[PDB]
Protein backbone atom coordinates (compact mmCIF):
# COMPACT_ATOMS: atom_id res chain seq x y z
CA UNK A 1 0.00 0.00 0.00
CA UNK A 2 1.18 3.45 -0.90
CA UNK A 3 -0.95 4.57 2.03
CA UNK A 4 0.76 2.29 4.60
CA UNK A 5 4.05 3.85 3.41
CA UNK A 6 2.75 7.41 3.99
CA UNK A 7 1.97 6.36 7.55
CA UNK A 8 5.32 4.57 8.17
CA UNK A 9 7.35 7.45 6.69
CA UNK A 10 5.47 10.19 8.61
CA UNK A 11 5.83 8.16 11.84
CA UNK A 12 9.62 7.73 11.58
CA UNK A 13 10.76 11.02 13.04
CA UNK A 14 7.95 10.98 15.68
CA UNK A 15 9.01 7.50 16.85
CA UNK A 16 12.55 8.75 17.38
CA UNK A 17 11.36 10.91 20.22
CA UNK A 18 8.14 9.40 21.49
CA UNK A 19 7.85 11.25 24.81
CA UNK A 20 8.40 14.76 23.42
CA UNK A 21 5.79 14.00 20.75
CA UNK A 22 3.25 12.28 23.08
CA UNK A 23 3.74 15.35 25.33
CA UNK A 24 2.41 17.58 22.45
CA UNK A 25 -0.49 15.16 21.93
CA UNK A 26 -1.50 15.25 25.61
CA UNK A 27 -0.88 18.99 26.06
CA UNK A 28 -3.27 19.48 23.11
CA UNK A 29 -5.78 16.99 24.51
CA UNK A 30 -6.05 18.88 27.85
CA UNK A 31 -6.21 22.25 26.08
CA UNK A 32 -9.16 20.97 24.05
CA UNK A 33 -10.78 19.02 26.85
CA UNK A 34 -9.60 19.87 30.35
CA UNK A 35 -12.40 17.71 31.81
CA UNK A 36 -10.23 14.66 30.91
CA UNK A 37 -7.52 15.73 33.36
CA UNK A 38 -9.07 14.06 36.45
CA UNK A 39 -9.17 10.73 34.63
CA UNK A 40 -5.43 10.45 35.23
CA UNK A 41 -4.96 9.92 38.93
CA UNK A 42 -1.94 8.73 40.81
CA UNK A 43 -1.33 8.48 44.56
CA UNK A 44 -4.99 9.33 44.45
CA UNK A 45 -4.32 13.00 43.78
CA UNK A 46 -5.92 15.00 40.95
CA UNK A 47 -3.87 17.15 38.61
CA UNK A 48 -5.01 20.73 39.15
CA UNK A 49 -3.62 22.02 35.86
CA UNK A 50 -2.46 20.40 32.60
CA UNK A 51 1.17 21.35 33.37
CA UNK A 52 0.90 19.30 36.59
CA UNK A 53 0.43 16.13 34.51
CA UNK A 54 3.75 16.85 32.74
CA UNK A 55 5.60 16.67 36.11
CA UNK A 56 4.23 13.19 36.95
CA UNK A 57 6.42 10.09 36.27
CA UNK A 58 3.29 7.96 36.20
CA UNK A 59 1.77 10.23 33.61
CA UNK A 60 4.93 10.53 31.45
CA UNK A 61 5.18 6.71 31.61
CA UNK A 62 1.52 6.58 30.51
CA UNK A 63 2.38 8.77 27.51
CA UNK A 64 5.17 6.42 26.45
CA UNK A 65 2.69 3.52 26.76
CA UNK A 66 0.21 5.24 24.40
CA UNK A 67 2.99 6.04 21.93
CA UNK A 68 4.13 2.37 21.97
CA UNK A 69 0.57 1.22 21.01
CA UNK A 70 0.36 3.75 18.17
CA UNK A 71 3.79 2.50 17.08
CA UNK A 72 2.33 -1.04 17.15
CA UNK A 73 -0.54 0.12 14.91
CA UNK A 74 1.96 1.71 12.53
CA UNK A 75 4.06 -1.55 12.50
CA UNK A 76 0.88 -3.43 11.60
CA UNK A 77 -0.69 -0.81 9.28
CA UNK A 78 -0.78 -3.30 6.40
CA UNK A 79 -3.00 -5.81 8.08
CA UNK A 80 -4.19 -4.29 11.54
CA UNK A 81 -6.43 -7.53 12.50
CA UNK A 82 -3.14 -8.80 13.74
CA UNK A 83 -3.53 -6.35 16.62
CA UNK A 84 -7.52 -6.61 16.96
CA UNK A 85 -7.64 -8.68 20.13
CA UNK A 86 -5.06 -6.57 21.94
CA UNK A 87 -7.00 -3.42 20.93
CA UNK A 88 -10.35 -4.83 22.04
CA UNK A 89 -8.73 -5.72 25.35
CA UNK A 90 -7.41 -2.14 25.40
CA UNK A 91 -11.00 -1.02 24.74
CA UNK A 92 -12.21 -2.95 27.79
CA UNK A 93 -9.69 -1.34 30.08
CA UNK A 94 -10.90 2.09 28.90
CA UNK A 95 -14.59 1.27 29.48
CA UNK A 96 -13.65 -0.04 32.96
CA UNK A 97 -11.88 3.23 33.92
CA UNK A 98 -14.89 5.24 32.76
CA UNK A 99 -13.95 6.61 29.31
CA UNK A 100 -16.74 7.21 26.83
CA UNK A 101 -16.70 6.40 23.16
CA UNK A 102 -17.43 10.07 22.44
CA UNK A 103 -13.95 11.05 23.74
CA UNK A 104 -12.23 9.13 20.93
CA UNK A 105 -12.65 11.95 18.43
CA UNK A 106 -10.78 14.50 20.64
CA UNK A 107 -7.86 12.08 21.05
CA UNK A 108 -7.79 11.51 17.27
CA UNK A 109 -7.77 15.29 16.74
CA UNK A 110 -4.94 15.57 19.30
CA UNK A 111 -2.93 12.92 17.45
CA UNK A 112 -3.51 14.58 14.06
CA UNK A 113 -2.64 17.92 15.62
CA UNK A 114 0.70 16.55 16.93
CA UNK A 115 1.46 14.99 13.50
CA UNK A 116 0.66 18.22 11.55
CA UNK A 117 2.86 20.24 13.92
CA UNK A 118 5.74 17.72 13.67
CA UNK A 119 5.68 17.26 9.91
CA UNK A 120 4.57 20.74 8.77
CA UNK A 121 4.60 20.79 4.95
CA UNK A 122 5.24 17.00 4.95
CA UNK A 123 1.82 16.42 6.52
CA UNK A 124 0.26 16.27 3.03
CA UNK A 125 -3.52 15.86 2.48
CA UNK A 126 -2.81 12.21 1.60
CA UNK A 127 -0.84 11.75 4.90
CA UNK A 128 -3.70 13.24 6.97
CA UNK A 129 -6.33 11.03 5.29
CA UNK A 130 -4.12 7.94 5.79
CA UNK A 131 -3.76 8.80 9.53
CA UNK A 132 -7.50 9.49 9.98
CA UNK A 133 -8.25 6.04 8.49
CA UNK A 134 -5.61 4.30 10.61
CA UNK A 135 -6.90 6.05 13.78
CA UNK A 136 -10.49 5.14 12.82
CA UNK A 137 -9.52 1.44 12.37
CA UNK A 138 -7.82 1.48 15.79
CA UNK A 139 -10.89 3.10 17.32
CA UNK A 140 -13.25 0.54 15.69
CA UNK A 141 -11.11 -2.31 17.15
CA UNK A 142 -11.03 -0.66 20.60
CA UNK A 143 -14.77 0.08 20.44
CA UNK A 144 -15.49 -3.67 20.52
CA UNK A 145 -14.24 -3.43 24.12
CA UNK A 146 -17.59 -1.72 24.77
CA UNK A 147 -19.49 -4.83 23.63
CA UNK A 148 -19.74 -6.58 27.01
C1 LIG B 1 -11.28 7.93 24.15
C2 LIG B 1 -10.26 8.77 24.37
C3 LIG B 1 -9.30 8.24 25.44
C4 LIG B 1 -9.31 8.57 26.73
C5 LIG B 1 -10.22 9.60 27.44
C6 LIG B 1 -8.27 7.80 27.37
C7 LIG B 1 -7.93 7.80 28.69
C8 LIG B 1 -7.13 6.84 29.28
C9 LIG B 1 -6.97 6.67 30.71
C10 LIG B 1 -7.73 7.52 31.77
C11 LIG B 1 -6.12 5.65 30.92
C12 LIG B 1 -5.63 5.09 32.28
C13 LIG B 1 -4.57 6.04 32.86
C14 LIG B 1 -3.84 5.52 34.08
O1 LIG B 1 -4.53 5.12 35.06
O2 LIG B 1 -2.56 5.53 34.09
C15 LIG B 1 -5.69 5.16 29.61
C16 LIG B 1 -4.80 4.13 29.40
C17 LIG B 1 -4.20 3.77 28.19
N1 LIG B 1 -4.51 4.31 26.95
FE1 LIG B 1 -6.07 5.66 26.69
N2 LIG B 1 -7.67 7.01 26.41
C18 LIG B 1 -8.29 7.22 25.20
C19 LIG B 1 -7.96 6.60 24.00
C20 LIG B 1 -6.82 5.91 23.70
C21 LIG B 1 -6.29 5.57 22.40
C22 LIG B 1 -6.92 5.93 21.04
C23 LIG B 1 -5.15 4.86 22.61
C24 LIG B 1 -4.16 4.27 21.59
C25 LIG B 1 -4.55 3.30 20.80
C26 LIG B 1 -4.92 4.73 24.01
C27 LIG B 1 -3.85 4.07 24.59
C28 LIG B 1 -3.77 3.74 25.92
C29 LIG B 1 -2.87 2.78 26.52
C30 LIG B 1 -1.82 1.89 25.82
C31 LIG B 1 -3.15 2.82 28.00
C32 LIG B 1 -2.49 1.92 29.06
C33 LIG B 1 -3.47 0.76 29.22
C34 LIG B 1 -3.03 -0.26 30.24
O3 LIG B 1 -2.41 0.12 31.27
O4 LIG B 1 -3.31 -1.48 30.06
N3 LIG B 1 -5.96 5.37 24.67
N4 LIG B 1 -6.31 5.91 28.62
Swiss-Prot record:
<dbReference type="InterPro" id="IPR000971">
    <property type="entry name" value="Globin"/>
</dbReference>
<comment type="subunit">
    <text>Monomer. Homodimer and homotetramer; disulfide-linked. Mainly monomeric but also detected as part of homodimers and homotetramers. Interacts with 14-3-3 proteins; regulates the phosphorylation of NGB. Could interact (ferrous form) with G-alpha(i) proteins (GTP-bound form).</text>
</comment>
<dbReference type="Pfam" id="PF00042">
    <property type="entry name" value="Globin"/>
</dbReference>
<dbReference type="GO" id="GO:0005759">
    <property type="term" value="C:mitochondrial matrix"/>
</dbReference>
<comment type="similarity">
    <text>Belongs to the globin family.</text>
</comment>
<dbReference type="InterPro" id="IPR050532">
    <property type="entry name" value="Globin-like_OT"/>
</dbReference>
<dbReference type="GO" id="GO:0019825">
    <property type="term" value="F:oxygen binding"/>
</dbReference>
<keyword id="KW-0560">Oxidoreductase</keyword>
<dbReference type="GO" id="GO:0005092">
    <property type="term" value="F:GDP-dissociation inhibitor activity"/>
</dbReference>
<dbReference type="InterPro" id="IPR012292">
    <property type="entry name" value="Globin/Proto"/>
</dbReference>
<dbReference type="GO" id="GO:0005829">
    <property type="term" value="C:cytosol"/>
</dbReference>
<keyword id="KW-1015">Disulfide bond</keyword>
<keyword id="KW-0597">Phosphoprotein</keyword>
<keyword id="KW-0496">Mitochondrion</keyword>
<dbReference type="GO" id="GO:0020037">
    <property type="term" value="F:heme binding"/>
</dbReference>
<dbReference type="GO" id="GO:0005344">
    <property type="term" value="F:oxygen carrier activity"/>
</dbReference>
<keyword id="KW-0349">Heme</keyword>
<feature type="domain" description="Globin">
    <location>
        <begin position="1"/>
        <end position="147"/>
    </location>
</feature>
<protein>
    <recommendedName>
        <fullName>Neuroglobin</fullName>
        <ecNumber>1.7.-.-</ecNumber>
    </recommendedName>
</protein>
<feature type="binding site" description="proximal binding residue">
    <location>
        <position position="94"/>
    </location>
    <ligand>
        <name>heme b</name>
    </ligand>
</feature>
<dbReference type="GO" id="GO:0046872">
    <property type="term" value="F:metal ion binding"/>
</dbReference>
<comment type="function">
    <text>Monomeric globin with a bis-histidyl six-coordinate heme-iron atom through which it can bind dioxygen, carbon monoxide and nitric oxide. Could help transport oxygen and increase its availability to the metabolically active neuronal tissues, though its low quantity in tissues as well as its high affinity for dioxygen, which may limit its oxygen-releasing ability, argue against it. The ferrous/deoxygenated form exhibits a nitrite reductase activity and it could produce nitric oxide which in turn inhibits cellular respiration in response to hypoxia.</text>
</comment>
<dbReference type="InterPro" id="IPR009050">
    <property type="entry name" value="Globin-like_sf"/>
</dbReference>
<feature type="binding site" description="distal binding residue; reversible">
    <location>
        <position position="62"/>
    </location>
    <ligand>
        <name>heme b</name>
    </ligand>
</feature>
<dbReference type="GO" id="GO:0071456">
    <property type="term" value="P:cellular response to hypoxia"/>
</dbReference>
<keyword id="KW-0963">Cytoplasm</keyword>
<dbReference type="GO" id="GO:0098809">
    <property type="term" value="F:nitrite reductase activity"/>
</dbReference>
<keyword id="KW-0408">Iron</keyword>
<keyword id="KW-0479">Metal-binding</keyword>
<dbReference type="GO" id="GO:0015671">
    <property type="term" value="P:oxygen transport"/>
</dbReference>
Amino acid sequence: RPESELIRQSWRVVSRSPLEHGTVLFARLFALEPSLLPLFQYNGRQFSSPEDSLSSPEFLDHIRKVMLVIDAAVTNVEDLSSLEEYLTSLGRKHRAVGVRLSSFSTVGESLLYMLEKSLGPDFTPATRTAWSRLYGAVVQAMSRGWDG
